[model samples]
Target: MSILFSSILFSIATFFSRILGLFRDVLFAKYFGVSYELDAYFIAIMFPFFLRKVFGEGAMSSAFVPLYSEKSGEEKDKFLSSVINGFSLIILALVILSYFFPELIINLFGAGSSHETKILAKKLLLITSPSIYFIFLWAISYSILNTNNKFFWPALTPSISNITIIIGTFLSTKYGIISPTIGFLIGSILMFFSIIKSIIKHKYYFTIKHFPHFLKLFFPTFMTMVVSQINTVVDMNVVSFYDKGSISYLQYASRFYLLPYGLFAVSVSTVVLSKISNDRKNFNYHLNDALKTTLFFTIPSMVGLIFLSTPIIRFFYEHGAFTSKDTLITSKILIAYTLGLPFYGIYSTISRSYHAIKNTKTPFIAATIVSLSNIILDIIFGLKYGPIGVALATSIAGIIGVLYLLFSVKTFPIKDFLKISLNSLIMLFVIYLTDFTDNEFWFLIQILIGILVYLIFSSIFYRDLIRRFLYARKK
Candidate 1:
């Protein structure tokens, strides 16, 4: 299948999942907003989802997919089985340690948390922490599904988590703060099980003879993923210092904020990854194509987030316990996140290309350097800029890291990216003319108008991509 159609399938499914996630956030705003309890829960919640990044896409996708693609038939089947059981071992270890030393785990991951806050955070973490294994197993299943050209279920399965959270939100008042934690445990288990029957259909049995090479690739890739995530890790830990709710504020602002990236960039990069690994002859070509696709989607998203942050946050979160205060804070953090969107967007595509060819060392080196710079930036300015400073540090690091990756890996579409940025700026200007208010009606109207203008201009200005996308489908 062509990347265009495959990406559309992935994007549509991912879009639905994100909508459920947004709904989940809406419920959080209604019930919990930014409170001391949520601060604790956000701390608790942060661990597993943080693993979703540290381990999920970066480590699991990079380490698992390429290797999985390298094999076939029975070989592929057994490899996945081994991968499944082995990752559970690693995940369970982290879970066991977190469960036993809850305070220590909280302090290490959340040093800036308050005495009372950390205590509550630790308690909530115990309930939420065990779910990590189920999530990682789901990640392995996703890698398996992607390599097998089964995109729909893998992308759609996360909504089970969102659905469960929404269900929990209804009972949150009755069940108390741990309701969301219960939702996640239920969701993770269901998501894990949903894929089991299908993945089980694939000649299943576990053995570790093949584990060494996977570990060889995984450790560096995991290190690379860990290095990349250390920026966020440092930022959140720092945000824990800024009174209660700072972490929750950033979390809410960022909720579903990266939907376009997931819908478009993720679709492109994920589809291309499977192809590029097998079709090494045209790796740079696929990489460049995916980068361009990422920019087409991401630049507009950056513009929207920065220019429309206030109205967007107001629409999603300005209610019940969310408060007018929460809206203001969340919007600022969202803006900070948008600045780095394009860099991170292309980084997704570029980094995967390196792994497609089995070259994790370069990403590791670049990530390590920029990762250090990010921590230094965070240390110097995290307190000074509030959460926004932390967000800015993340953007700066993404740009630094992506620049390294671009020069390190050739065939990046810089000229096209600049053009997309220009078009996005034009779209930004159109949206900027509208004076934003708390009125959801006008906010959405302007967003639609601005996006219409963007679509019209982009269709002409970036028509080559349109042509390329369509032409690929005819193949």
Candidate 2:
């Protein structure tokens, strides 16, 4: 399929999932209102999410996809089965460990939480612990699907998760958090069945034979993922320690900011990953294309977020229990997050490029730098500025991370990168000037006008880039 077609398909599916995710956050903000309860829940969710990124998505898929796709016929089948068996055994071990040591897990994340919050967090952790298995199995299935060019179901599965969460949240108001936990349990069950169905339908048989080769890929990937996962977990924990509602505030803001990030950056990166992994002959060309595509979307998104974060936060979440104070705090976190947008966008592509080449170590080195920076900054500023400080620290760490990765890769086009930044600054200045004398209505109007002006000016000035995009499907 054409890149444009694939992008469109991915965007539409991601948009639906992100919208539902936004709704889920809205429910969370309304019901929990950035309190200890919400904080505990966010903290609890962090462990499984960390595990999912590390063992399931980030490193595992990075290592598995290229290796599995390189083999053929019986060899490929054997490799695939080994991967599934090895992965399943590891997940089973993790599940047992998590169940037995729920308190220890909770304590690690909730060290700064109150006694009540920590206890509640333990319960939530236990409830969500099994999700690790579900997520890992799903990732393996999705990796195989991507190899077979079956993208739609994997892209849409997140929507199923969102729908389940939303239903759970709605039921919670009538019942309690247990209602939502139950919904999550049901969703996890559904996820398992969905993976099984996809595998069966695709005739990708699962067996024990592929387990050994899978371990070869899995171990290195796991170590790399651990550093990356630690970066995320530490950042969240730093935010959680700030105040009772800090974790929830950051979570809500992240959800809002990640909308565009997921729609554009993630879709582009995933598509690029599959393409690059498959086309190893022209690796540089594909990597450069991916970088350009990421910039095309991410530069504008970062500028827009910086410009409209306050209004966006106010418009979406300033309701029910989410007061003006919540809006103000969330806006601050959103702006900090904006600083990392372009870095994050590029990082996704760069890391995947390494993964496609089976070079997981380079990305891991970058991740190590990122985690260390975050930890140092968190210790330095977390106590003084609280949640906002945590966000700022993460942004700084991301900047460092991206720089290290770019230096290591040495293939990032400097001139193109400079042009993208220059245009983004131009757009930012225009947006700021247009809205300098803002009344709320005028603010909204100016934002709309600014977007139009941006598009027009960008089209006029970057005509070549536009032409390239238009002809992206020609090949």
Candidate 3:
């Protein structure tokens, strides 16, 4: 498949998944509101969701896809088997440990919360913890499908979980908060089941032959994920000390920021990693094109999110327990985090470049640098400015991470970046001149017009790039 086409396939499927995710958030806001209970819910799901982002997203695939692609058919099956057995044990043991020490995990991540909140979070974790095992299992299945160029099903599978959780949100009144946690478990099992067959045709015989080599390549990626996750844990810990709903505020804001990051940045990264793994001959072209395409979409996306942050937050979240005050705080945090949208997108692309080449150590080093910076900045800024300050610290750290990685890689998409930046500025100018309204309808119109204006200018000024993107696979 062409890079552009596969990215579209993945993005389109992810589009639905993210849409379902947004709706799930909407239901969460309406049903649970920005309360301590909601904070508890977020905390309970935090570790499990972190693992999801790590394995289900790109980290596992980053290491696995390259090696899997290198293997012949039988070797591929054996490698797959080894990965399955090894990770299942590790994750299952963690889940069992979580069951025994749920409170400890809660205290580690949500230490600043009230005793009642901590207790509730622990109970929720007891229910949601198993999803970690299921998620890791599904991630392996997901990666196997990806190595086979089966992008759509794996990308689309998250919606099954999202939809299940959404339905469970409606049942929360009857079953309490545990409904959603139970729904999460059911959904995860279903998710694994949905994709399990894709890898079934390949025989699974448990062996440790490939396990050691896989661990050599996978361990750094795992540590990098842990370091990156530590950054989030740091943010959560800092926010846990704030007002009652601070953690919820931060989580909601980031959920909005992730839409574009997931839709375009992840889509491009997934396809590029697979392409680079399967076809290493045109490495430079693939790398640069991925960088260019990531910038083209994300630069304007960053600007648009900044311009529309308040209105978008208010439109979607200011209902039931989600007050106007909540919207105000969430929007500020959203803007603070959205500032790093393009940097986050670029980081995803470049990090995958390192991973595709089996250079996981650089990403681990980069993640360490970013984590330390984020921890320091998060504490300093968080103490002075609260949640918004914490968010700003995240953006700054992300920028530093991208620069370090870019310098290390010695690959900057300067020309394409300049072009995207200029057009994005033009789009911002047009958005500025437009009649500003504070409602969802007007904000939606603003988004459509900004997209239209940006595309028009791109067609006028960078027609060749557009043509190249359209027919990129052919060349």
Which candidate number would show the highest TM-score if scored against the true structure? 3
CA lDDT, candidate 2, residue 421 = 70
Compared with the true structure, what per-residue lDDT tens digits does model 2 show for residues 1-475?
6444565577777667677777788788778676787777777677665654343334566677888778887777667766666767877887788778878888887776899888887787777777877777777777777766666667777777677877988887787776666666667667657767544443355677766656665665556445434655686777766665688788878767656666665666566667878888877888887787677667777787777888788777776889989989889988887777777767767877777877777776776777799899988898888878887887788789889988886777777677767777777788877766535456567556666766676677779977987798585
TM-score of model number 1: 0.83
- Per-residue error at 167 for model 2, in Å? 2.8
Poorly placed runs, candidate 2 (over 4 Å): 1-11, 28-46, 49-57, 97-127, 149-153, 171-176, 195-198, 201-213, 219-229, 236-255, 316-330, 380-390, 422-475
Each prediction's whole-model lDDT (CA) = 0.77, 0.72, 0.82
Candidate that scores best on lDDT? 3
Query: Model 3, stretches more than 4 Å misplaced?
Result: 29-44, 99-127, 172-178, 225-228, 239-252, 318-330, 380-387, 465-475
lDDT of 1 by residue, 1-475 (tens): 7665677688778878888887888788889876778778778878777766454354677888888888889888878777777777887898898988998889976677788889988888888888888778777777777776777778888899899988887888898788887887898899889987656667877676677788888887777656535665577777876544588887776554556546654566677677788788898788887787778777887787677788788886786678878888889888887788777767767777788888888878777767787888887887767888888888898888888888887666779888888888888888878865556768778878777878888888868878988798799
**What's the best-to-worst order under lDDT?**
3, 1, 2
Two-way lDDT contest, 1 vs 2, winner: 1
How does residue 200 of candidate 2 score in lDDT? 48
TM-score of each: 0.83, 0.80, 0.87
Q: How many clashing pairs does model 3 include?
A: 0
In candidate 2, how many Å is residue 85 off?
1.2
* Model 1 residue 389 distance off true place after TM-score fit, in angstroms: 4.3
